[PDB]
Every structure is written in C-alpha cells, then in structure tokens.
Design a protein around this ligand. Structure first.
Ligand SMILES: Cn1nc(C(=O)N[C@H]2CCOC2)c2ccccc21
Ligand SMILES: [Zn+2]
Length: 140
C-alpha cells in the first residue's frame, strides 16, 4: 500500500483505489495502473521533473529503503495477477530489487523529488509507475 500526496491530489495504484477515491476521481489510466483522487488537506510530497535513472524506493516487505538503477519509462509486458490479465503496461520502469505484491504504492524518489510508485515485480525485479510526465499534478 501507499500513495503520493502532492497539492490537493492523492496518487495511488489504480488496483488499490478505494470507494472514496472513485467517488472523488480526478484521473485514472488502467494501462499505467494509476488513479488520482482529490483531497481536502494539502500534501507535502513534490514531483521530480527530470530524466534520472537512479533513485531510492521504499520496500514495505523489508521495512527498508533501497538505492536502485532503473530503466526509462516504457511499454512492458506484465504477467497476469489477481488485479489484471497479462497485458502491456505503459510508462513503467524496471529495476533489480526485492518486491512482493503488497509493496505496491511505495515511493521511488530521486534528488529532484518523487519519481513514481511501486506497481509490478517478482524474482528480484521491481517495477515503478512513472508520474514525472503528469505536469498537472504540481505547477499546472
Ligand atoms: C510489486 N509487485 N506487484 C506485483 C503485481 O502483481 N502487480 C500487478 C498489480 C498492478 O500491476 C500489476 C507483484 C507480483 C509479484 C511480486 C511483486 C509484485
Ligand atoms: Zn531526478
């Protein structure tokens, strides 16, 4: 679990969105595994606006933050899960790091700010849904 809280937005994995998220929907994209809802309180996270390929992510199944090198956002085949059939996910970045299904929502960050959230993984890989192209989250 986990979310990004920037301005009056809450960014979560679409597959973990609650009824309250759907009832306060701003934007969602199934191909990216992302959903954004509106918040009453202002958040403290800021979004990175960069092309970094190194950063640090939070792994809830280890209670630890790990440094990672990651690929640029791209279209990658993701195996079937209880949340989606096997399909291509867009704007996804892969890294070598531990992950388990419930690690989704952990933040990946770089020196500039938040880069994205854990969305896919297995067998010593972890995949992150990029948010750096969503300019409307923070200075729009
Ligand atoms: C971090 N992580 N995520 C999944 C996963 O199945 N994600 C789907 C749900 C949303 O997009 C694909 C996974 C599986 C096995 C080990 C780790 C894992
Ligand atoms: Zn950066």
């Amino acid at each position: 679990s986990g979310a990004i809280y920037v301005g009056n937005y809450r960014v979560v994995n679409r597959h973990l969105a609650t009824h309250n998220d759907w009832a306060n929907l701003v934007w969602e994209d199934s191909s990216r595994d992302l959903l954004v809802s509106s918040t009453t309180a202002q958040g403290c996270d800021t979004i990175a606006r960069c092309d970094c390929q190194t950063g640090v992510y939070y792994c809830s199944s280890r209670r630890k933050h790990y440094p990672v090198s990651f690929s640029k956002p791209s279209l990658i085949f993701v195996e079937a899960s209880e949340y989606y059939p096997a399909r291509y996910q867009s704007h996804l970045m892969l890294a070598v790091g531990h992950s388990e299904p419930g690690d989704c929502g952990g933040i990946l960050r770089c020196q500039h700010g938040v880069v994205g959230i854990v969305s896919t993984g297995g067998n010593g890989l972890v995949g992150f849904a990029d948010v750096r192209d969503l300019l409307w989250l923070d200075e729009e």
